[PDB]
A and B are shown apart, each in its own frame.
Chain A
């Protein structure tokens, strides 16, 4: 689900 990558992109 790429949670850390999604987090690094969104905030």
Chain B
């Protein structure tokens, strides 16, 4: 029912590794400060996406048991979760409470960033769906770890070894759901449901970058490897 000392240890360790990320206030303040062209926003996106991959590899290496997995499976998990984890992190930043009228301006700035209108509606539908869940910092950290340690990822040789590492993270998350929302017993299932909505963003990620309203789509070598561009 309640968290065990081992689970609390796992939780604080996941929280410490996760907090090594970029400040949500820093990112939203830049977007809200002034309007940028589709070209400036494309450059901001590639820089933010390159840094996110680097921070994600460090968070993943610290995930208990990750370094014991086969080296090829290690790459397949990272390649399979990188884009999903970046969208989950954008949804987290999107739903952070801000002064009156700021989240309306943040939405309008993201709508006019340069992204193709075809992707605007599915993106905001996911962001709003995440927001309705009123997720805590610990829930975002554990859900990101669960997304990375997905055994049902493509090209995984040893799925059972991945399952063994994901299961204790799922157990901690379920206990937090029962504690933070005892009136909503559907909460844990709702979180796992939102992960299938995440997976549907992975299908058109390359197109989302290529269809950006710019003439030149320049990427860093690391981005070319993670996003398939």
Contact = CB atoms under 8 A, between A and B. Distances in A.
A10 B221 CA distance: 18
Interface residues of A, number: 8
A5 B221 contact: no
Contacts, number: 25
B61 A2 contact: no
B225 A4 contact: yes
Interface in A1-11: 2-6, 8-10
Interface of A is mostly: helix
A2 to B, nearest CB: 5
B221 A2 contact: no
A4 B219 CA distance: 14
B78 interface: yes
A8 B54 CA distance: 8
A7 to B, nearest CB: 10
